[PDB]
């Protein structure tokens, strides 16, 4: 098996490089954030523009959905994160505390908490209801590239340019594990596997790795793409065959066989670094977005 993703649509609208694309949990929406300071909502199946949500003062590096597809959180260079009511498009709260760019964000499964990572080298945990910061973790010694809750919310994983990936206990904020990748190259992205037993990390040495964090063992490696400059999102595609999906600095989307580590398909079309990709929660659909010379978003569909 090799998926056969083909272009569905090209979503244009952003005036600057797109930074992140995410599918809502119920699967009917695609939310995008851009260096143009805007967030746009699109129809996941028709690729139809739905609305623009604005408010941030500077570019936005990331956006995440709440478990009920009703809320959206964004991380911006203006040093804040913003919680948005998706249907009205208005800003419910502005999370303040970070002393530099906020680079990444995510709701926990319960969606009562928000975790953020910033260039200030800290990871903060916020209360969604009040917009207050509950904890500030002295997580790394360099910018934090990614933050992610595991499936039960008890854990948080963070990656950093300091070359480390750390597992944190959500309730206490204490570090449970620090992982080293021998040469310790900058970690540009990390995320738990759907079942929560693994961690997929991207390092700026053109390499992706699946780790059993508990054992500190590398089970698989995915290479062949180009990644030594930007923090490119990576995904687990489990709707059909089990694949590993990721953007690449050579303008293509890479799809690997998760078990054999074999490249099963490269999607062509974008005209600049594919900085972000997302996998639809129920259908074999992929959303990809590129930088400045492209600024478009593409929806791909496969029989898988």
């Amino acid at each position: 098996v090799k998926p056969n993703y083909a272009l569905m649509f090209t979503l244009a609208g952003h005036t600057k490089a797109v930074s992140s694309v995410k599918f809502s949990p119920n699967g009917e929406w695609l939310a995008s954030s851009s260096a143009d300071k805007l967030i746009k909502i699109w129809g996941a199946y028709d690729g139809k523009f739905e609305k623009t949500i604005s408010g941030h003062k500077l570019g936005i590096s990331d956006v995440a959905w709440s478990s009920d597809s009703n809320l959206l959180v964004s991380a911006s260079d203006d040093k804040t994160l913003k919680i948005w009511d998706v249907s009205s498009g208005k800003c419910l709260k502005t999370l303040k505390g970070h002393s530099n760019y906020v680079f990444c964000c995510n709701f926990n499964p319960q969606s009562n908490l928000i975790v953020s990572g910033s260039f200030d080298e800290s990871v903060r945990i916020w209360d969604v209801k009040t917009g207050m910061c509950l904890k500030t973790l002295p997580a790394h010694s360099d910018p934090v590239s990614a933050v992610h809750f595991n499936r039960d919310g008890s854990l948080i994983v963070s990656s950093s340019y300091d070359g480390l990936c750390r597992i944190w206990d959500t309730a206490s904020g204490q570090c449970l594990k620090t992982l080293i990748d021998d040469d310790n190259p900058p970690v540009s992205f990390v995320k738990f596997s759907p079942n929560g037993k693994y961690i997929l990390a991207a390092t700026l040495d053109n390499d992706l790795k699946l780790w059993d964090y508990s054992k500190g063992k590398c089970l698989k490696t995915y290479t062949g793409h180009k990644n030594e400059k930007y923090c490119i999102f990576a995904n687990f595609s489990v709707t059909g065959g089990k694949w590993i999906v990721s953007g690449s600095e050579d303008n293509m989307v890479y799809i690997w066989n998760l078990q054999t580590k074999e490249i099963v398909q490269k999607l062509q079309g974008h005209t600049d670094v594919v900085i972000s990709t997302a996998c639809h929660p129920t259908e074999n659909i992929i959303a990809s977005a590129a930088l400045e010379n492209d600024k478009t978003i593409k929806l791909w569909k496969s029989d898988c």
Partner: peptide, 5 residues
């Protein structure tokens, strides 16, 4: 700013 290196 993820869009910048």
């Amino acid at each position: 700013a993820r869009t910048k290196q």
